[PDB]
């Protein structure tokens, strides 16, 4: 059978259209907000958490509003770091909300999560007709109207994100795999990536200095890779860079670019800080 | 720092354009080929593994005479440097779902990105290999857990090396575990769910039914779900439900695994 293509989208400053602000809408918001996307939310009513969490500028419906278009709210002080809705339109979707006043701009992603299925299908088809089949669309819980699927997620300390997708299995299985992965890193505790980052840096540099440069130098790549694979994510933060540089020097020169490190158990006892 | 949005795209039968059939192109083919996508590859020359693995029919334009999404093969190969006219699609209700470049010339790569964004709009997905500012998305470290589960690891301002290391760690976890027999788990979780509905069909116990299944399946975990004894868990559900006023307090995990597995 066919696999999905799993991708990590860079949404900072991208215009995103979310139609439906209820329970499913809110879960869409939890995933979209930390991305820096510039989102327009269209919904006649909102789940109770949305205003306080992501759009404190939206006014309650019973406050008098004398603007010519009282349904539209623009966050007056928006930026990608806010984690805030950019634009809220209090209304059922209407075709003219697809218009971006400015026609260089475009919606990177258009999503729906409303209780009307025939209206969702109509929106999907209108969006593909207006913006082409290249326009990404997702109609919540309607696989035939989705270009992509959200799945089970987990974060491994602020810089690592994992997505778990199923190819024709219940989402249930994705959540079980997620908890399993989360248990694994929970048991592992601190990975101290800050320090792992540094040391892989000075490892790289150090080896470049000893390098003997263009041409085996892929050996530098394959050497740093095999070495760090043998330490793994658990121990890269604890490598003694100087001892490994002395081991590289010997494997690079005087061994003819050997790529045959010592057994893992030894590498961990002789070359960790 | 912003987080990325990780998504799983359904490309079965979608047109995909790849420009550059070298080393980097070969790595793009590895990820695109199992997706059922209908790919056009544009390149004057090809890395030697491409034809053998993905375009045997290649032996200016080469159309695969026996293409289908299960083949894992290129649909169309254009032996040429990219020309603007290769953006055109016969039926123009058709579109390229993703457009990717993997060529050594930077200005030409950037020209292609802007041309595609101009012609197909900023909604058009584009990725220029190794040029962050010309990419709408990034590939990352992947692994399969069977032929049914797919995992993507992405780094946020961290070398991709960490993605690979986390990936190899998750791979090892599932390697230790052994066969998960998810086809059987799928069947048992279905018969479990059907059974519970019968023991508690009224509209008012919907939620209970759900949380009971969820807590139960959580406790068996991905590793043991294929081995549950449905009948026996049904008898356990009966007691927890009727008798114990909808109890969600289950036998402790190691008993649950010993008694309720076959
Ligand atoms: C998923 O997505 C759907 C939504 O599920 P939910 O649990 O969040 O339901 P919900 O009732 O909690 O949320 C539905 C939301 O969509 C909004 N809405 C209704 N009609 C709309 C329209 N025509 N245009 C824009 N917004 C509209 C409602 O105001 C509400 O905010 C479900 O039916 C399922 O398909
Ligand atoms: P990287 O490591 O893959 O580099 P590489 O040299 O391994 O690959 C570059 C690939 O891009 C192709 N190419 C170069 N210019 C091109 C162009 N204008 N249009 C299409 N294909 C082009 C080359 O034939 C080669 O197949």
Swiss-Prot record, chain B:
Active-site residues, as the UniProt record annotates them: 130 (proton acceptor)
Record-level Gene Ontology MF annotations: ferrochelatase activity; precorrin-2 dehydrogenase activity; sirohydrochlorin ferrochelatase activity
Stored InterPro entries: Met8-like, Met8_C, NAD(P)-bd_dom_sf, Sirohaem_synthase_central
The protein's annotated pathway: Porphyrin-containing compound metabolism; siroheme biosynthesis; siroheme from sirohydrochlorin: step 1/1; Porphyrin-containing compound metabolism; siroheme biosynthesis; sirohydrochlorin from precorrin-2: step 1/1
Quaternary organization: Homodimer.
Function: Catalyzes the conversion of precorrin-2 into siroheme. This reaction consist of the NAD-dependent oxidation of precorrin-2 into sirohydrochlorin and its subsequent ferrochelation into siroheme.
Record-given protein name: Siroheme biosynthesis protein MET8
Primary gene name: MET8
């Amino acid at each position: 059978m066919v696999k999905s293509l799993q991708l990590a989208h860079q949404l900072k400053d991208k215009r995103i259209l979310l139609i439906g602000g209820g329970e499913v809408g809110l879960t869409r918001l939890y995933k979209l907000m930390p991305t820096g996307c510039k989102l327009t939310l269209v919904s006649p009513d909102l789940h109770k958490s949305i205003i306080p969490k992501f759009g404190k500028f939206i006014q309650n419906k019973d406050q008098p509003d004398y603007r010519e278009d009282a349904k539209r709210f623009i966050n007056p002080n928006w930026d990608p770091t806010k984690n805030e809705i950019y634009e809220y339109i209090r209304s059922d979707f209407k075709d003219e909300y697809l218009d971006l006043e400015n026609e260089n701009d475009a919606w990177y992603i258009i999503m729906t999560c409303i209780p009307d299925h025939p209206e969702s299908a109509r929106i999907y088809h209108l969006c593909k007709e207006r913006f082409g089949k290249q326009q990404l669309v997702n109609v919540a819980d309607k696989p035939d109207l989705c270009d992509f699927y959200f799945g089970a997620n987990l974060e491994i300390g602020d810089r690592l994100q994992i997505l778990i997708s199923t190819n024709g299995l219940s989402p249930r299985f994705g959540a079980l795999v997620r908890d399993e992965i989360r248990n694994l890193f929970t048991q592992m505790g601190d990975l101290a990536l800050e320090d792992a980052v540094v040391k892989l840096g000075e490892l790289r540099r150090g080896i470049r200095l000893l390098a003997p440069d263009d041409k085996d130098v892929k050996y530098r790549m394959d050497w740093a890779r095999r070495c760090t694979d043998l330490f793994g994510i658990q121990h890269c933060h604890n490598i003694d860079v100087k001892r490994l540089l002395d081991l590289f020097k010997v494997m690079f020169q005087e061994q003819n670019c050997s790529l045959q490190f010592p057994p893992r158990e030894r590498l961990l006892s002789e070359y960790c800080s």
